[PDB]
Each structure stands twice: as C-alpha cells, then as structure tokens.
Amino acid sequence: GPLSLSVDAFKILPKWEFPRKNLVLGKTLGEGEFGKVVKATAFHLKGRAGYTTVAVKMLKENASPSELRDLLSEFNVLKQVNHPHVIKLYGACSQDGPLLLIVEYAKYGSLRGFLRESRKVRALTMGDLISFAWQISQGMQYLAEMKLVHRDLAARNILVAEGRKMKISDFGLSRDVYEEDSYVKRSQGRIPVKWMAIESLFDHIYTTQSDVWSFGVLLWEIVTLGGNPYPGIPPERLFNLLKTGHRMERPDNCSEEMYRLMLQCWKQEPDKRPVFADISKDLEKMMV
Amino acid sequence: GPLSLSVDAFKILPKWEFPRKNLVLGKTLGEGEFGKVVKATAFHLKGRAGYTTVAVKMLKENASPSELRDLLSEFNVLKQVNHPHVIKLYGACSQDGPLLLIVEYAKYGSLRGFLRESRKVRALTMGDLISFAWQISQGMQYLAEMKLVHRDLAARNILVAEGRKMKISDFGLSRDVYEEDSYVKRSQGRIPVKWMAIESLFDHIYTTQSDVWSFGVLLWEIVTLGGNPYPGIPPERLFNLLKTGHRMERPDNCSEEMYRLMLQCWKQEPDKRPVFADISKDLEKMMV
Numbered sequence: 001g002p003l004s005l006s007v008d009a010f011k012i013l014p015k016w017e018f019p020r021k022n023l024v025l026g027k028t029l030g031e032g033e034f035g036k037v038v039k040a041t042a043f044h045l046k047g048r049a050g051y052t053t054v055a056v057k058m059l060k061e062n063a064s065p066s067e068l069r070d071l072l073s074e075f076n077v078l079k080q081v082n083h084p085h086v087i088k089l090y091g092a093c094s095q096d097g098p099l100l101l102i103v104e105y106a107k108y109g110s111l112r113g114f115l116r117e118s119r120k121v122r123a124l125t126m127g128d129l130i131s132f133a134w135q136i137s138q139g140m141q142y143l144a145e146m147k148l149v150h151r152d153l154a155a156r157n158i159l160v161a162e163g164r165k166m167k168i169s170d171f172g173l174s175r176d177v178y179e180e181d182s183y184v185k186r187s188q189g190r191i192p193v194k195w196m197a198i199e200s201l202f203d204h205i206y207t208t209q210s211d212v213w214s215f216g217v218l219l220w221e222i223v224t225l226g227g228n229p230y231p232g233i234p235p236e237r238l239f240n241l242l243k244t245g246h247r248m249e250r251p252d253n254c255s256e257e258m259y260r261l262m263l264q265c266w267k268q269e270p271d272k273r274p275v276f277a278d279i280s281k282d283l284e285k286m287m288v
Numbered sequence: 289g290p291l292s293l294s295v296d297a298f299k300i301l302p303k304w305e306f307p308r309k310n311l312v313l314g315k316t317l318g319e320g321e322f323g324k325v326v327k328a329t330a331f332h333l334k335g336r337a338g339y340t341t342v343a344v345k346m347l348k349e350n351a352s353p354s355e356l357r358d359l360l361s362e363f364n365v366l367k368q369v370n371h372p373h374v375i376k377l378y379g380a381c382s383q384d385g386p387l388l389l390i391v392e393y394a395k396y397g398s399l400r401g402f403l404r405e406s407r408k409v410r411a412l413t414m415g416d417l418i419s420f421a422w423q424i425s426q427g428m429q430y431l432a433e434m435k436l437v438h439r440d441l442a443a444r445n446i447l448v449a450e451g452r453k454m455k456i457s458d459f460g461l462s463r464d465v466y467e468e469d470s471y472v473k474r475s476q477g478r479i480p481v482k483w484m485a486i487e488s489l490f491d492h493i494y495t496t497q498s499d500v501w502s503f504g505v506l507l508w509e510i511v512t513l514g515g516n517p518y519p520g521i522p523p524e525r526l527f528n529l530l531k532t533g534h535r536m537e538r539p540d541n542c543s544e545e546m547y548r549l550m551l552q553c554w555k556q557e558p559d560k561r562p563v564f565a566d567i568s569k570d571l572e573k574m575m576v
C-alpha cells in the first residue's frame with residue numbers, strides 16, 4: 001500500500017544518516033499522539049566536535065501504520081524546512097534498529113508547559129507573551145510561503161528554545177499544498193477538535209487560512225498562560241456552537257486589540273481571516 | 289461531513305439514556321488510544337435497585353474528530369451485541385455534559401495486566417491459559433456470525449471479569465461487513481502494526497480472517513503471560529519479515545499443538561486460516 005511503498009523506498013534511500021553508535025538516549029521528555037521524544041546526546045553530529053545534546057523522536061510502543069506514516073512524513077518535511085522559528089533536523093537513524101529522528105533540543109520544553117509554570121506581570125510581561133506569538137507568526141509565514149499547511153498548531157506543539165526562542169514542531173500532520181492550495185482528508189482527522197477551523201471540522205478542508213484559525217486558538221492559549229480552549233464545553237458541542245457563530249469570550253488580562261486579532265482568525269470565511277504577514281505586523285504594533 | 293451528520297442525528301435521537309445525576313465517576317482505570325475509562329457507580333441502573341459499580345468510557349482531553357467518531361461507533365456497535373464473552377453496555381449519558389458510555393466493570397482489569405501480574409504453574413495452569421483463549425474464541429465466533437470485524441483484538445482489549453470470565457471490549461475500530469464480507473480502509477489504520485494481518489498491512493483489507501490473525505497474536509500473548517509480540521523488532525520491519533514468510537518462533541512453555549494453532553492463524557492466505565468455530569474446537573481438545 002502507500003505505506004509499504006514508503007518504507008521500502010526509505011530503506012533503499014544521504015547526509016541525513018547518523019551512526020546509531022554515536023547516539024545516546026536518555027529520559028523521556030514527552031509523549032502523546034504519534035510519537036515519543038527522549039533527551040539524547042550525539043557524538044560528532046554534523047561537524048560539531050564532541051557531544052551535542054539533542055532530542056530524539058521515535059515510535060511509541062505498539063505503533064499503528066498511521067503513526068509510522070506520520071513519523072516518515074515529519075522526516076520528509078523537516079529535511080526541506082529551515083527557519084529560526086522552526087525546529088531543526090540533524091538526521092535520523094534507520095539502519096540497525098528502530099527509526100529515530102534526531103532533532104533540536106529545546107531547553108525550556110513545550111510552550112504549554114512553559115506558560116503553565118509561569119505568571120503574568122516565572123514572571124512574564126504581556127510584552128513577552130506577544131513576542132512569543134510574533135515569533136510563531138514569522139515561523140508560520142515562512143511555512144505558508146513554502147506552501148506547507150502545519151494542521152496541528154497549538155501551544156503543546158511549540159517549543160521554547162534558548163533565549164526564550166519559539167520553535168514550531170510536530171510536522172507529523174503537515175501537508176504539501178503547492179498544487180491546489182488545500183489539503184483535503186476524506187476520513188476523520190487526528191487534530192484535536194478544539195483547534196480545528198470550522199471548514200476543517202465540517203468539510204475536511206485544510207489551508208493556510210485554517211492554520212490561521214489554529215493560530216487564533218494558540219493566541220488564546222498564550223494570553224491565558226496555558227488555559228484549555230472552550231473550557232468545560234465538550235468537543236462534540238463544537239460543531240453546533242461554531243456553525244451558529246459562537247466563539248470564545250475575551251479572556252482575562254487580554255487587551256482588546258489582541259482579542260480582536262483572535263476574533264479575526266476565527267472568521268467563518270477563510271478569506272476574511274488575516275494572513276500570517278498581517279498577523280505579524282499586528283503583533284509588532286501591539287508589542288510597543 | 290460524515291461526523292457532523294452523526295453527531296446531530298445522535299443529539300436528536302431510547303432506553304439507552306441514563307440520568308447524568310445518577311452516575312458517579314471515580315478513579316481512572318485506563319487510557320491509551322481513542323478514550324479514557326473510569327470506575328463509576330450508577331444509581332438505579334436498568335432495573336437494578338441501589339448502586340451498581342460500572343465502567344465509564346469517555347473522550348480523553350483534546351479529542352480529535354477521529355476519537356469522537358470511534359466513541360459513537362463503539363456505542364452503535366455495543367447496542368446490537370449481546371454475549372457472555374462480549375462487554376455489556378448499560379447506557380450512555382449525552383444530554384448535559386460530555387458523552388459517556390456506561391459499560392460493564394471487570395473486577396480483574398485487562399487480560400494483559402492480569403497475565404503480567406501472574407506466573408505459570410498469581411498462579412495459573414496452562415489449562416487456565418487455554419480456557420482464556422477459548423472464551424475469546426466463542427466471543428469471536430459470535431461477532432463473526434453478526435458479520436462484525438473487531439479489527440483490534442489483543443490482550444489489552446480483553447477484560448477479565450468475575451469468575452475469570454473473558455469479555456471482548458473496545459469496539460471503537462469494529463466495522464460491519466454484512467454486504468461485502470470485508471472492510472477496506474483507504475487511509476492508514478490505527479491498529480498496532482504488530483497485530484495486523486499481512487493483507488491488512490499491505491492492502492488495507494479487514495475480514496473475519498484477519499481477526500483470526502490477531503487472535504493468533506493474542507494466543508501468543510496468553511501463552512507468554514503478556515509478552516510483547518515480535519520482541520525487539522521495530523514495527524516498520526514487519527512488512528518485509530511478514531511478506532518474506534517470517535513468523536514468531538515457538539515461545540517457551542508453549543505446547544506444539546498451541547504453536548501449531550498460532551502458525552495457522554498466520555497463514556499468508558486468509559482462506560487457509562481456521563475459522564473461530566474450528567479454533568474453539570481445537571482449544572477444547574487441548575484443554576484435556
């Protein structure tokens with residue numbers, strides 16, 4: 001099938017390969033959907049003398065064809081992508097054991113955990129908050145320019161690297177949209193309902209503009225310091241609440257220009273939402 | 289889409305509804321893929337005076353359209369099914385809060401945990417082991433007769449109820465095959481690679497005979513007291529090992545007639561595998 005074809009083409013296929021003997025695995029940093037990520041260290045990694053501390057993405061126990069598919073796809077995507085606000089790939093190990101992707105280690109963990117262990121003024125201004133949002137916007141403008149739809153943009157999918165630098169990660173669900181400017185999935189998707197654009201939920205259509213919708217949910221998360229979207233509202237209720245025109249209220253400690261920006265990422269019509277370029281301009285304005 | 293249609297038809301739709309006020313939730317029993325299961329107690333449940341201790345299946349945090357789809361489907365399936373070796377449904381709560389399915393509580397937990405906390409002779413004969421396998425076979429013959437393909441048969445998906453009684457659970461991935469005797473999924477499935485039949489892996493075809501293959505993996509698990517299939521072999525290696533005719537070796541403390549039975553559930557050609565009726569006969573033979 002499509003998968004066995006990919007796996008065999010992959011096993012037959014550069015400068016992405018890394019000796020498994022030079023990689024040492026350590027504690028688990030995170031799990032969840034699709035994979036496991038462990039802290040690691042790599043000896044003589046792409047020109048760097050000695051050890052570099054890295055993160056290693058692998059298949060969890062009992063992986064389905066779907067999670068294997070997502071791992072190989074994330075690898076194919078990350079090889080093409082380069083940007084200061086996108087996670088960096090160093091290589092992979094595929095030869096004498098499990099498939100492992102060697103990626104950039106982020107000193108501060110996920111954006112969601114980073115926010116949750118902090119407070120509004122770890123102390124963080126709303127100027128830091130908006131700075132976070134902005135770095136992500138630039139990241140996203142870049143991937144949009146690459147004709148790439150992330151699909152799974154969320155605080156748990158952004159890493160905080162050294163310097164409090166945002167890195168977009170988790171390219172498992174990302175899809176190329178060069179040809180048609182849309183990705184359409186016939187079956188039910190694996191993105192959390194509460195982050196999906198209204199057209200993705202009802203019609204299974206994903207574009208840069210539905211990434212825009214997720215970005216609005218992610219702003220909400222940033223502003224709330226790691227709150228849970230639509231708190232206390234079950235996911236199945238979202239179909240009707242969204243189509244009947246309902247949206248999350250302005251949270252506490254949110255400025256009107258920020259909430260105004262979220263509201264615009266959640267317009268029903270994908271065309272009436274801003275594009276990442278104009279989002280970034282909006283945030284840079286707010287940040288002064 | 290197909291999902292919003294189901295959700296609205298469900299919200300518009302008997303004697304399956306249960307007052308949410310009469311249900312009390314308690315500790316988490318299990319999680320993983322698709323849902324969470326919590327211990328609960330239900331007041332005045334389907335004719336039963338007082339409280340009955342039950343299990344409650346719900347959506348985990350941040351559920352995708354896919355997990356919601358699997359929850360509603362499991363509910364639709366469980367309403368049609370009745371057998372001493374299939375989990376019993378009591379009802380659901382859908383009205384004023386999250387969707388919850390109220391099912392049979394199994395005193396001993398999953399078959400996998402039950403086996404792992406035991407020893408060959410908690411002490412268990414190989415006669416108990418084979419008894420477990422047999423109860424599952426009868427369960428499966430019944431669902432096969434209902435023209436139902438389980439798809440996700442595995443020790444973690446069997447519960448051990450009072451009397452050490454096996455109950456097949458987790459009907460999330462189950463599919464009706466009345467019309468065509470097969471279920472075909474175009475996209476990549478969410479069943480663990482190591483439990484899927486060779487035709488399911490390569491061609492995305494599921495039938496009662498690929499359930500037979502999973503049952504062979506499950507026998508292996510029973511015999512090994514909760515071992516991990518294909519230990520130390522990465523899932524992606526399975527395509528080639530399976531198509532080149534490789535199979536798990538006879539494990540320790542396994543009789544030849546038992547291993548002979550697994551080997552037959554793993555024939556390349558779905559037609560050369562036994563049917564559950566003949567599997568059950570084989571096990572009842574062994575059990576003396």
Ligand SMILES: COc1ccc(/C=C2\C(=O)Nc3ccc(N)cc32)cc1
Nearest residue numbers: 029037055104105106107108109169
């Ligand atoms: C201070 O605690 C930490 C917690 C999580 C991380 C996680 C990741 C990390 O460092 N790089 C990653 C790449 C992909 C994914 N999914 C996760 C990570 C790092 C540090």
Ligand SMILES: COc1ccc(/C=C2\C(=O)Nc3ccc(N)cc32)cc1
Nearest residue numbers: 317325343392393394395396397457
């Ligand atoms: C002694 O420890 C226990 C551990 C898990 C259970 C789990 C379930 C249970 O009791 N009923 C269930 C129905 C569906 C699923 N997935 C799981 C369960 C019960 C008892």
